[PDB]
Design a protein around this ligand. Sequence first.
Ligand SMILES: NC(=O)C1=CN([C@@H]2O[C@H](COP(=O)(O)OP(=O)(O)OC[C@H]3O[C@@H](n4cnc5c(N)ncnc54)[C@H](OP(=O)(O)O)[C@@H]3O)[C@@H](O)[C@H]2O)C=CC1
Ligand SMILES: NC(=O)C1=CN([C@@H]2O[C@H](COP(=O)(O)OP(=O)(O)OC[C@H]3O[C@@H](n4cnc5c(N)ncnc54)[C@H](OP(=O)(O)O)[C@@H]3O)[C@@H](O)[C@H]2O)C=CC1
Ligand SMILES: NC(=O)C1=CN([C@@H]2O[C@H](COP(=O)(O)OP(=O)(O)OC[C@H]3O[C@@H](n4cnc5c(N)ncnc54)[C@H](OP(=O)(O)O)[C@@H]3O)[C@@H](O)[C@H]2O)C=CC1
Ligand SMILES: Nc1nc2c(ncn2[C@@H]2O[C@H](COP(=O)(O)OP(=O)(O)OP(=O)(O)O)[C@@H](O)[C@H]2O)c(=O)[nH]1
Ligand SMILES: Nc1nc2c(ncn2[C@@H]2O[C@H](COP(=O)(O)OP(=O)(O)OP(=O)(O)O)[C@@H](O)[C@H]2O)c(=O)[nH]1
Ligand SMILES: Nc1nc2c(ncn2[C@@H]2O[C@H](COP(=O)(O)OP(=O)(O)OP(=O)(O)O)[C@@H](O)[C@H]2O)c(=O)[nH]1
Ligand SMILES: N[C@@H](CCC(=O)O)C(=O)O
Ligand SMILES: N[C@@H](CCC(=O)O)C(=O)O
Ligand SMILES: N[C@@H](CCC(=O)O)C(=O)O
Ligand SMILES: [Zn+2]
Ligand SMILES: [Zn+2]
Ligand SMILES: [Zn+2]
Ligand SMILES: [Zn+2]
Ligand SMILES: [Zn+2]
Ligand SMILES: [Zn+2]
Lengths: 495, 495, 495
Amino acid sequence: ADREDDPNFFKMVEGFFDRGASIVEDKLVEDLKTRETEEQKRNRVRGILRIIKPCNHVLSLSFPIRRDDGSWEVIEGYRAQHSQHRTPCKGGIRYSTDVSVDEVKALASLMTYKCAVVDVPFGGAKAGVKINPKNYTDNELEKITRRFTMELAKKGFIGPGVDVPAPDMSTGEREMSWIADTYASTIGHYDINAHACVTGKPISQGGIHGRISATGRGVFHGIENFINEASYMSILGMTPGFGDKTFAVQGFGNVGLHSMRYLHRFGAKCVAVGESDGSIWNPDGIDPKELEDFKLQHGTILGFPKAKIYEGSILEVDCDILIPAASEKQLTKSNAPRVKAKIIAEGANGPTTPEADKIFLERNIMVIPDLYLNAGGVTVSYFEWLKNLNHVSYGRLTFKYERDSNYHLLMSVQESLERKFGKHGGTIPIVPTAEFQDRISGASEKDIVHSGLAYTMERSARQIMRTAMKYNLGLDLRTAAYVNAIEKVFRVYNE
Amino acid sequence: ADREDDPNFFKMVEGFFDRGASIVEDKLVEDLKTRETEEQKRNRVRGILRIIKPCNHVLSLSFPIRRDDGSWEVIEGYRAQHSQHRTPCKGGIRYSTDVSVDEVKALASLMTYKCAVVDVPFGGAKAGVKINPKNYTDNELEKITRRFTMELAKKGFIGPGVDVPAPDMSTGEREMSWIADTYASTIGHYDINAHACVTGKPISQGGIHGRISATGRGVFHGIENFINEASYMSILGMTPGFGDKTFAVQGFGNVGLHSMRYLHRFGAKCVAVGESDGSIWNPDGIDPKELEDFKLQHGTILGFPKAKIYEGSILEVDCDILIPAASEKQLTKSNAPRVKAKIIAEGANGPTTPEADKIFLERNIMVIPDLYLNAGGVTVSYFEWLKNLNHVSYGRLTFKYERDSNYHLLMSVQESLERKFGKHGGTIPIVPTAEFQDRISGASEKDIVHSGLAYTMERSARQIMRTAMKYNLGLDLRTAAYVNAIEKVFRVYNE
Amino acid sequence: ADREDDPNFFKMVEGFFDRGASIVEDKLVEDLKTRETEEQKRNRVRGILRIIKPCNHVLSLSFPIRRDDGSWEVIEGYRAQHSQHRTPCKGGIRYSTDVSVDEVKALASLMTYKCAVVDVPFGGAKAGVKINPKNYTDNELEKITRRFTMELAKKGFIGPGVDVPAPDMSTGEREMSWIADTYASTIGHYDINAHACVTGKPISQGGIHGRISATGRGVFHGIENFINEASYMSILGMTPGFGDKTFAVQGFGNVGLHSMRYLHRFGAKCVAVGESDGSIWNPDGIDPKELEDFKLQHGTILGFPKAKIYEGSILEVDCDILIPAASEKQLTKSNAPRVKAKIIAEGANGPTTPEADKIFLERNIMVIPDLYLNAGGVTVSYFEWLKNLNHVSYGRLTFKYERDSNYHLLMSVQESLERKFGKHGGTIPIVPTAEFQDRISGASEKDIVHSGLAYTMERSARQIMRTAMKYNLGLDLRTAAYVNAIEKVFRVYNE
Ligand SMILES: NC(=O)C1=CN([C@@H]2O[C@H](COP(=O)(O)OP(=O)(O)OC[C@H]3O[C@@H](n4cnc5c(N)ncnc54)[C@H](OP(=O)(O)O)[C@@H]3O)[C@@H](O)[C@H]2O)C=CC1
Ligand SMILES: NC(=O)C1=CN([C@@H]2O[C@H](COP(=O)(O)OP(=O)(O)OC[C@H]3O[C@@H](n4cnc5c(N)ncnc54)[C@H](OP(=O)(O)O)[C@@H]3O)[C@@H](O)[C@H]2O)C=CC1
Ligand SMILES: NC(=O)C1=CN([C@@H]2O[C@H](COP(=O)(O)OP(=O)(O)OC[C@H]3O[C@@H](n4cnc5c(N)ncnc54)[C@H](OP(=O)(O)O)[C@@H]3O)[C@@H](O)[C@H]2O)C=CC1
Ligand SMILES: Nc1nc2c(ncn2[C@@H]2O[C@H](COP(=O)(O)OP(=O)(O)OP(=O)(O)O)[C@@H](O)[C@H]2O)c(=O)[nH]1
Ligand SMILES: Nc1nc2c(ncn2[C@@H]2O[C@H](COP(=O)(O)OP(=O)(O)OP(=O)(O)O)[C@@H](O)[C@H]2O)c(=O)[nH]1
Ligand SMILES: Nc1nc2c(ncn2[C@@H]2O[C@H](COP(=O)(O)OP(=O)(O)OP(=O)(O)O)[C@@H](O)[C@H]2O)c(=O)[nH]1
Ligand SMILES: N[C@@H](CCC(=O)O)C(=O)O
Ligand SMILES: N[C@@H](CCC(=O)O)C(=O)O
Ligand SMILES: N[C@@H](CCC(=O)O)C(=O)O
Ligand SMILES: [Zn+2]
Ligand SMILES: [Zn+2]
Ligand SMILES: [Zn+2]
Ligand SMILES: [Zn+2]
Ligand SMILES: [Zn+2]
Ligand SMILES: [Zn+2]
């Protein structure tokens, strides 16, 4: 959404993909042990990547909606299913007038690779409805998200075993609660797992802890996994830890709000927030809760008391971490050289262009790629789907057993020691640390979503770092991610 | 029975609901953050509350049977589903002549509120067939069970993801076995979950441990949690603990007997048991096992040696704990004044009417409401359903692994204690407690049923107790319960 | 093919089953509660058994294939399903020219009793296709197994909850991956468990760790569980353990190879390998990894540098353990007199005829029977089917949480101890041993596969031993197995 650096979104991801695929093409051919080796392996690798790139299924919908004034409006909509190498497909629904089959094809291709980076067992899919939800009433929105769902279900583009959606820009809990309900009510009344047909749902309708803040929490973790690796902080020329540093977020939505929230909590200082109508600034810090508070009461952030209204690209604030948490293609050729930050935390899906990437590369700015950084969402989504399939709130059946097993464990160590040091020690009590006391009943659902997220973010950071160093990609972390993703997906097509 | 206090079962439970519905009314109202405020909320609340109360679907059957002698007899039956706010619906099949669409309706609703109290994710449901089983041969009872399953199946009132029935009065393992068999042999031949279609099954047919005795056991756990609470035991004027307590039991069925078994087990003296033809009595104690033996032997509890035949309402026996475990509407305004017991443990479904509830409160008899006490049934039926869904005996895959790990964990405390106390300590064997040795391979199925039930019946007892004290219901435990059932259900309907 | 002791495979297996039944007939009768005592107790038992013996269903197939050369070829095939007392049926697919309806029938019956022995909740089934796989192309072997999958799909002889096939002779990962796909391509396109329709799948395609290796790994465990019971090695006249031991293996396929791997890993010297074009032999040891490389490089074992072409029945090689791991009816009345080994571990399916079983009995030769010994297969098959159902890799969500739990757990022992022993201890570190360090995150998938298998095999080993002694069967391990399989399947037969 720019001027003279606005590449076709799908091809822009194909561009990233194609790059990380030459980095491994040698590795893939060497891997494949096919008896007809040769270039008849080089090419059967060439064939396989050629099948991965294009979305397998796209469905373009035109369906009518009775507006609230009575009039009829033909509402446009698409869901692309990138890959089935794992079913079901996974990916959000976006309500925007930028929605096009190519944008939605791209977000789709971005989603399989996002799930490969964090080893989430879904092929990618994405959906968009070409509307601007500020122009519609809640009742209209409901009328839309439901009719969109009925069309998806009858053509096989939603369903717990075939394709599971999620939230995105201008969608969220509410519209997730609608989709779930119209599918379960119609196409899947007999389907035991009907409410696993979409993620992002309200806690009470089958959703999971922290799903709303999930993408932003995972954003904090991806940054932490690098903000603390001195290997890179050296190459950057700045010091480890969050306690030093300063950041600005583009976008105050589910991603941005929660990206701010957590970075602030662990010490970092938010100097600048912006949305589609302006940006505010104050190097002394902006408290996410006051900002949020103000945002909720005023429909905008502009004119926040404890900050100035910043004239100028927030992308170009003076800060250490810039977090694009709005939409795509916001860091482009023309404005990359003015970025002033050292780290670009890609909250959003593909907010930086290939050619901004190259500016950042040689300008020694670390772009942490969307592929990995915003996969907090699908992770905690996958957890939500898994919650649905399992039909049990994590911990429920085992809390009392482990609280029990653990005192009996602890009591074993007590008794053993008292058996030996009869009265020299006397009564050796063996009791939980405050922190083991919290852990003592086993993981709760909240427990699993935080730790399982961390585990994923730290592990997928690692195999990005291990892969970045194995190929000397330096700060080009993006293509390192597409290397692991291309790697894993090819494996499925391979065997 | 009772002819002057025979309220229509559905409206009666509707009453209990409404009551609890009022005390939350201000709470629910202030919770919901709807922007359109003031009293558009208060309507919203009794608007949602007005959808909860009525049953969504009720299915009336008339189907023919060929009796043994060769005649044709027509059997009528019903199944009511009260909610789908949780899929599937859960609820028993009862075979009595009292069955009417209405009692099946009230029973179903009761099941919805029940599962809410007890955090089981099922909407309530219930069936009934208008036969006295006693009057049919085993072969006939089979035909009736099967054809009634086919009717429920075709019209979609049974199925693992729609509606999982279960036992009730005059049905047990045997019948569920036939239900599960004709379902899975016809409609379910393809369902990987065909045997999750019903619960209460023979363990050999998909059942779970202790599902027969599970509602009895949950009765005990429910009584215990209060009887061991000094706050209520002061108010009630009785000693904490089961040691000094005497109790009587109306009904000697699945929940009748096993309630006796577990209460007798932990120290309570069962002085009297009743059935549909009379009661027996002995304030020196009746042993469940001897009584069970005699009953299976002579089809009647009457004429049991070690206890006299008690002339009169066993409900009115002198005792600590009165446990209705028969049909509904047995403690009424007629006989509520002269009950004698200080704790009513509603093992049966809706056994004390609201008129009695009133007397009991200002008499300061404590009523543990069926809502919370007999949920030990679904809770294990929920476990059985979960067992079927997972297709593994709990523990099977982890027994050895957990056995080994605890051993190496224990070993690490040892090798570390010796690493410090070189030889003044010597060799310090760290060994499992006899009880941690039982708990060393991890929880078996049995362990999950026992412990999961215990956790459940207490976690729910606490938030009942907490809600009694927050709204000063004192001993109106039922009203706190519905207050919690409502609060949890309402949360679904609006969010 | 033995020209004087070739019983019809099905009847032969019926004999083993008959044998065991008359042993527990008195047992089944006495347990049977039945009011109708007497011998109408005996006759229901024998009627039920009369139901268990015959296969419930057999599908015979004729379907044409157009060969690579463009000619038309009528491929015959079979699937028999023997029991549904557990759904789905389980059992391998076999490609051979021996595949007859009677052979397929026998193998399927062998599956139901096999899973009964190892407590794998599957009725048994088996399919063959009457082809020499050596005589067809990869392309032709795909058209065949794909069309066979379609024939099996459309008549209900494959489906994740109806009948889950798996590998067997001349089938493997590559065929399973086709079955799985062909099924999930078509019929199962909406099935959330389409990929659980078959086991043996590649790991990237829903397979499980070590399932190729699973069966012989259980052959190892099953031998191990017997080779270490002094009671049985006494009777035998051999030393406990693998230390000094020596074995020959008929068959070098998926059972033969890994049986030979694992036995070799834990001591034993493999002295003969054999296939269908001959045997090799070397008393001083055949290293399995060597023989694999040579096999893989030469498509045969004959002329393996480190052994001599053995001439003469591999079944009569001098060794401690003879392992038939090929086809059935290898050890027959003609050559059983000449077998020389003391433990016959039946990794194959039905390798030993009944007349040869008799000879082995009175020769004091312990045949560890197929029924139990090669059930490592289904068990790990079971594990993968569950893997597919649970849609999560084992441990994924709990690793990080368990790590921190154990560290705080130990940290609790540390600080508790330091609180007592102020400075007379000083700093009392408590750390994981090396072994508990490996388990400190919880069980990985392979962890479960390895310990789950081992658990299953030791437990099943025991209940066979337990049965043998109680029935004074001594070395008739087979009848002990059938006696458990009959016991277990019966008792499901309750209405
Ligand atoms: N769970 C999720 O929702 C996940 C989201 N993502 C990605 O992160 C991005 C944001 O998602 P989310 O934050 O949920 O969407 P939301 O709609 O919830 O929040 C959107 C934010 O972006 C701002 N914004 C949009 N366009 C611009 C612009 N051109 N210039 C400045 N600010 C702008 C909006 O401001 P205004 O309100 O003024 O338009 C708002 O602050 C998307 O690209 C999404 O794909 C990644 C992973 C998961
Ligand atoms: N899982 C369950 O079974 C659950 C059951 N409940 C409730 O428990 C109650 C009993 O269930 P269950 O015990 O399974 O039924 P059963 O058929 O198992 O046995 C019921 C017993 O109650 C007796 N009885 C019935 N009505 C009367 C009466 N009016 N006066 C005296 N005795 C009577 C019967 O006597 P006879 O045999 O002589 O008729 C029989 O002995 C039911 O109301 C059920 O809804 C609640 C939660 C779970
Ligand atoms: N999961 C499994 O695979 C399980 C298999 N089994 C049983 O084990 C046996 C084979 O399993 P699998 O290893 O999969 O079969 P494979 O297809 O893997 O080949 C087995 C081996 O047997 C050899 N062989 C075949 N026929 C003869 C013969 N007449 N004389 C000598 N050697 C012969 C083959 O050599 P050639 O190539 O020359 O035929 C090959 O080395 C069957 O009985 C099967 O049912 C038991 C449990 C599970
Ligand atoms: N937008 C917003 N979300 C919040 C706020 N406080 C908590 N949350 C989110 O609400 C969900 C539940 O929060 P909590 O109940 O406080 O528990 P939590 O897991 O500690 O959540 P976190 O505070 O993010 O770590 C989490 O997703 C939180 O991120 C808030 O002030 N604003
Ligand atoms: N009718 C009857 N049931 C019993 C008896 N003993 C146990 N049960 C129930 O039958 C099932 C099998 O009993 P057990 O295998 O001993 O299991 P358990 O959990 O240790 O038994 P309990 O703790 O007494 O419930 C359990 O659900 C018991 O509750 C009995 O003597 N009579
Ligand atoms: N056919 C064959 N299988 C092998 C060979 N080496 C290992 N495997 C099997 O392939 C699987 C993958 O091996 P690993 O990742 O090393 O796992 P593992 O659990 O340590 O396997 P084990 O060596 O049997 O203990 C396991 O089932 C191995 O048994 C081999 O040389 N040939
Ligand atoms: N749409 C979000 C999350 C998708 C999901 O939760 O499935 C993303 O870009 O990753
Ligand atoms: N009908 C039983 C519960 C049966 C079940 O769903 O398992 C009750 O009223 O609580
Ligand atoms: N043919 C194999 C089947 C194993 C499986 O089901 O994977 C056996 O005899 O056990
Ligand atoms: Zn349409
Ligand atoms: Zn959280
Ligand atoms: Zn009908
Ligand atoms: Zn029990
Ligand atoms: Zn056909
Ligand atoms: Zn392994």
